[PDB]
């Protein structure tokens, strides 16, 4: 059952990759969808057998590394944590694959797209099912490889080509730290196995654990697009919408969260790292929400929403609430994928395929089915009570105040503003696209129609899972005393009681009041008093709008300062060292030295009795002189060469 | 529609909306082969998988710990 779940998606990638020419476009797409569905069913069978029956599955293919005490095998395990990650991964991948059948129907290279899409699914499965960190690193690297081939799928477009490179190189920066963390793990424990390293967490030096997990934290920020390594996330929007739907829901963007949750036994014994994760997640939540309220591209806003939600998972990790982070991760994979699918449905519905929301308006009646999917997903994202997001996101915001520390209190305000912004840009996005006065030409509206059933089918399935999913799965992950030994929580770090009971009743509804109430204020201003938002008049508003529309100027700072200087260092090394001093102390310098010396010696060779006679007589001075003067003669000879 | 130069450009993944005339015949040959591999993976997976939490009794672990002291 385990082998069928893992390597079946790899079969679909191989079939479409190398046999897609011989079977045609249509059969290639459905065979790939068939392979993912086999993994979907096998995962659900294992979920019942693992979570409910407390059973584990381990398959050991063969040994990989056998260098003295360092033994690494090609082994895959399916525990509670692995099968908990598999459900968002394989299910959303299948629904994205089903979505991709009709969305990509007009693309000339559908066979390759499904080959890359299924390869990414297989890489992510290997990431969460490996029983040691090295098998995780195999999936970790091929996740970036497949994403690079997916973002730059339209390689004839310059922006897509450079965007894919940006995602790869930034993720490789995390991979470099990830390798360093694994090397230190071998240095300290002599192994990378989960069963070995996690059994020594309480006995290892805190400094050693910090260094390993600081490397893990840097690697996590690149994949999860946290502050400092988040520029590539918005550049990923150059790829097709099915890539963005899969990438930002239950994939590479969430890989950083899984790495920290897997390392929970080690992470509990270095509280300083938890403090860094808490602030890094809190800052990213605040920054992402502010940017998304002044953004115009529909996919950029949702991408920024993904960055804001992933940070909410990080702050849960920072307070040692690994169960909270995992549950919000599973729920977020369902309604965020729905947003991208429905956003891509709006882009296909409009004939011009515009993506700027400023050119939208009055789509609510023309495409009601897409609007309802967006509306339901938005409410689930906004943690409206009763929905999946409410049971998964609202508890994390409460946990910040329930921590009752200085950092938790500060992050609570950042999370509270993030929650308020989450409702603000959702209303703003909906109003511009569906409720605003029409901006596109009238010819667009007389040809504006909903898409086919094949595109709709995954969205409806996700829509239902975006309403009832969180309620059914809350007790598995958020129930008190539920056995989740894969995620280790130290007894001193269990704050699920002070979060649940000690909270003032006002804080339980404060995000709701700021969300719905703040959203209504924004909606009223847009409809009747839009003259307020003509921000090109005020100078301070123009700068403030420009500062957040340019994404905290981080992209400009990253390129104009960091990347340019790194390239200039190579230029300085090339000019002054490789082509410079090493040529002066090399062939070019020695040639000039040889030419100067050999020119002098050429004038010393000519037939002359007086010339040779004086030299012979001069050599008689060597006999006369005391030998201690030889070095002075040697210096004198060099002086005459000049 | 357009010109794709398909006479010589023959990538493994098709080259601009490619579907051979005998696509139905090859699809069946692939589905049977694909089905023959999932079953083989299933048989290998069942015969090779094991439960790591049941390979040793807790009494055996107690003896290991006492001897390791």
């Amino acid at each position: 059952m385990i082998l069928l779940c893992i390597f079946t998606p790899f079969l679909g990638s191989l079939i479409s990759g190398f046999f897609g020419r011989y079977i045609g476009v249509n059969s290639s797409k459905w065979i790939v969808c068939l392979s993912i569905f086999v993994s979907v069913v096998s995962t659900y069978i294992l979920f019942i057998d693992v979570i409910f029956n407390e059973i584990e599955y381990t398959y050991n293919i063969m040994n990989w590394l056998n260098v003295e005490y360092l033994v690494v095998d090609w082994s895959f395990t399916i525990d509670k944590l692995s099968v908990s990650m598999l459900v968002p991964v394989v299910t959303v991948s299948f629904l994205v694959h089903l979505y991709s059948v009709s969305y990509m129907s007009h693309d000339p290279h559908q066979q390759r797209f499904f080959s890359y899409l299924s390869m990414f699914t297989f890489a992510m499965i290997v990431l969460v099912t490996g029983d040691n960190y090295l098998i995780l690193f195999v999936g970790w690297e091929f996740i970036g490889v497949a994403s690079y081939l997916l973002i730059s799928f339209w390689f004839t477009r310059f922006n897509a080509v450079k965007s894919g490179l940006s995602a790869l190189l930034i993720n490789r920066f995390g991979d470099a730290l990830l390798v360093l963390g694994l090397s230190y793990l071998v240095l300290v424990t002599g192994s990378v196995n989960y069963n070995t390293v996690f059994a020594l967490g309480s006995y290892l030096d805190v400094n050693m654990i910090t260094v390993i997990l600081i490397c893990f934290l840097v690697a996590s920020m690149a994949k999860s697009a946290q502050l400092g390594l988040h520029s590539w996330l918005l550049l990923a929007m150059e790829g097709p919408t099915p890539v963005s739907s899969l990438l930002h829901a239950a994939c590479l963007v969430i890989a950083g969260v899984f790495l920290l949750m897997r390392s929970s036994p080690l992470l509990e014994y270095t509280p300083i790292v938890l403090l860094l994760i808490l602030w890094l997640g809190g800052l990213s939540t605040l920054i992402s929400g502010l940017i998304a309220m002044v953004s115009n591209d529909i996919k950029k806003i949702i991408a920024l929403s993904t960055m804001s939600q992933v940070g909410i998972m990080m702050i849960a990790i920072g307070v040692s609430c690994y169960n909270l982070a995992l549950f919000h991760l599973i729920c977020h994979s369902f309604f965020k994928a729905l947003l991208f699918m429905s956003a891509g449905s709006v882009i296909h519905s409009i004939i011009s395929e515009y993506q700027d929301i400023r050119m939208y308006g009055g789509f609510r009646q023309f495409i009601p089915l897409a609007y309802t999917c967006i509306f339901i997903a938005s409410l689930s994202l906004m943690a409206i009570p009763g929905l999946t997001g409410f049971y998964s996101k609202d508890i994390i915001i409460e946990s910040m105040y329930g921590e009752y520390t200085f950092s938790g209190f500060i992050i609570y305000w950042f999370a509270l503003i993030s929650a308020t912004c989450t409702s603000l840009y959702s209303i703003r996005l909906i109003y511009y696209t569906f409720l605003n006065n029409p901006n596109s030409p009238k010819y667009i509206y007389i040809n504006l129609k909903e898409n086919d059933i094949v595109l709709i089918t995954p969205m409806i399935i996700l829509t239902i899972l975006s309403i009832f999913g969180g309620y059914l799965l809350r007790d598995i992950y958020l129930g008190m005393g539920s056995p989740f030994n894969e995620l280790f929580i130290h007894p001193n770090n269990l704050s699920l009681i002070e979060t649940e009971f000690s909270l003032p009743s006002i804080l339980k509804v404060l995000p709701l009041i700021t969300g719905l109430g703040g959203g209504l204020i924004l909606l009223l201003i847009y409809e009747f008093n839009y003259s307020l938002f003509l921000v090109y008049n005020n100078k301070n508003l123009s700068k403030l709008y420009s500062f957040f529309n340019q994404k905290i100027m981080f992209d400009q700072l990253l390129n104009n300062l960091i990347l340019r200087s790194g390239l200039n260092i190579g230029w300085l090394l090339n000019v002054h060292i490789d082509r410079g001093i090493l040529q002066l102390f090399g062939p070019l310098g020695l040639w000039k030295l040889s030419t100067f010396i050999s020119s002098k010696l050429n004038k010393l060779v000519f037939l002359n009795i007086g010339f040779i006679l004086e030299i012979i007589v001069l050599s008689w001075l060597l006999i006369v002189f005391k030998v201690s003067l030889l070095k002075y003669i040697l210096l004198l000879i060099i002086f005459i060469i000049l | 529609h357009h010109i794709h130069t398909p006479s010589y450009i023959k990538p493994p993944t098709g080259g601009w909306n490619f579907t051979p005339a005998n696509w139905k015949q090859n699809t069946v040959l692939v589905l049977v082969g694909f089905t023959a591999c999932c079953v083989g993976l299933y048989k290998l997976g069942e015969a090779g998988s094991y439960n790591p939490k049941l390979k040793y009794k807790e009494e055996e672990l107690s003896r290991w710990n006492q001897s390791a002291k």
Binding site: - | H1, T19, P20
Partner: peptide
């Protein structure tokens, strides 16, 4: 319709 003709038999 696009009616993309089938290519040479492979």
């Amino acid at each position: 319709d696009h009616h993309t003709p089938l290519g040479p038999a492979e």
